[PDB]
Copies of this chain bind each other. A is one copy, B any other.
Amino acid sequence: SITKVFARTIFDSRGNPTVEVDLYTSKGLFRAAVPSGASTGVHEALEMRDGDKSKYHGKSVFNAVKNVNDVIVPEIIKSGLKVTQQKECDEFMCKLDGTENKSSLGANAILGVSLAICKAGAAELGIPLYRHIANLANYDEVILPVPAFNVINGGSHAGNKLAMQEFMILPTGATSFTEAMRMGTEVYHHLKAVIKARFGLDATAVGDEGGFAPNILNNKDALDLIQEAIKKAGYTGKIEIGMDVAASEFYKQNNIYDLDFKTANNDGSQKISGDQLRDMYMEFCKDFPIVSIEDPFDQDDWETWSKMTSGTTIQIVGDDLTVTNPKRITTAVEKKACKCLLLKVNQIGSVTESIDAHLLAKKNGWGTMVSHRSGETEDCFIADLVVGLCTGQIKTGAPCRSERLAKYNQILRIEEELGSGAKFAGKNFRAPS
């Protein structure tokens, strides 16, 4: 039974406030922190912000904290639900909220308690959190994921001329997670050495996810830069590439995508149509070892999504397209729009829903890439979520900044626990099962 639930505000990796929940049972204290969400979102659960422009730039979360403290806490304690009853606790809070998007109490309020309950339930059962999540999703075995390291950025996420938002390296050729960390960091540092030489030390500064953002003129340069880094590290072949086009951010209208949206009066050549964009991806896939492309088209340009998923054999990740929303996931499934779900727990708002969202994707053949948010905390819950859900792939930032490393370090700790019987997703990261 839950004896006490208490929320407070802490600060995320970007200096913004966020909810942190302290939950007690006779086993003790179980702390959980919520990552940056969307106060306003397309189909995602809405995180509650105070909006007071004076206070913390309108990003304070006193209202969400209040909701946890004098609404959720009293109710859930009086409910008499055990931390061992995840589904029920989460349903309770959902009933308590009463809205589809959790806008009455705030997804950040509901998720904080939900994560704490999950950690508590695991303790209640005397098993590790990953094992607990495994059992919740009905998995008998667990597998260590291949890390998708963010290394170079673009789009709205930086200046430069890069249209594509993210460029990541996946150590699929590694034999273990330890080796994956070794490969990932070595390349990161080799990439930094390459970037500082080609663009100067100022280009060595990092963004929200710990990746670099040199003033690269084109997407191909980004890829070549990564290639050189992989070469210097001596891992060509063992390391593959992933991308997050986030084409939604750069879609004009009627099948038009402007690869140069970052300029006023864009009357240049990079104002191509979706079909031309799709071909560009095909060209990239031919020359570069690209094994995964996230959000290649607009979140509503279904037709081109299906065309690309139909003829490429690589992983096509849905993010803005699916927003960890079962309704959106179903549609993408029916339309065969993609083959991988980017799982963001705070996008849906609760642990069981996140698990169900994943199970839905899997049931229909998709892979699942567990994802972090731009505003993370020192909480490493998703590290246990990716191992327990047996997804084989997690995208939790570059191996720089501790809100990123917090997760990777945890997975290293889990790998240690599993011992020799620790399975690394490797090449079959897409669906290790």
Contacts and interface: CB of A to CB of B under 8 A. Distances in A.
B401 A13 contact: yes
A182 B186 CA distance: 38
Given A158-B201, A202-B213, A13 B185 contact: no
Contact of A402 (B8, B13, B207, B213): B13
Given A56-B186, A186-B56, A402 B12 contact: yes
Interface in A173-225: 181-182, 185-186, 188-189, 200-202, 205-207, 213, 215
Interface string A378-417: 1010000000000000000011111101101100110010
Interface string A7-25: 0111111111000100000
A213 B412 CA distance: 33
A400 B15 contact: yes
B202 A160 contact: yes
A97 interface: no
A215 B202 CA distance: 8
Nearest to A181: B11
B406 A402 contact: yes
A57 B16 CA distance: 34
Contact of A377 (B15, B377, B380, B402): B402
Nearest to A402: B403
Q: How many copies does the complex hold?
A: 2
A377 B400 CA distance: 10
A172 B67 CA distance: 32
Nearest to A376: B402
A205 B213 contact: yes
A159 interface: yes
- Report the interface size class on chain A: 35 or more
A380 to B, nearest CB: 8
A380 B11 CA distance: 14
Interface string A127-169: 0000000000000000000000000000000111000000000
Contacts of A286: none
A400 B213 contact: no
A188 B57 CA distance: 11
Contacts of A377: 402, 405
Contacts of A12: 402, 405
A213 B205 CA distance: 8
A399 B189 contact: no
A55 interface: yes
B15 A189 contact: yes
A413 B33 CA distance: 13
B202 A158 contact: yes
Contact of A182 (B56, B399, B402): B56
Given A158-B205, A205-B206, 15 more contacts: A8-B412, A8-B416, A10-B409, A11-B181, A14-B400, A15-B400, A56-B185, A57-B186, A57-B189, A159-B200, A159-B201, A160-B202, A202-B213, A401-B403, A402-B403
16 contacts: A8-B413, A11-B185, A12-B405, A15-B185, A15-B189, A16-B185, A20-B409, A55-B182, A56-B182, A159-B200, A205-B205, A206-B206, A378-B405, A378-B409, A401-B403, A402-B402
Interface of A: 8-16, 20, 55-57, 158-160, 181-182, 185-186, 188-189, 200-202, 205-207, 213, 215, 376-378, 380, 398-403, 405-406, 408-409, 412-413, 416
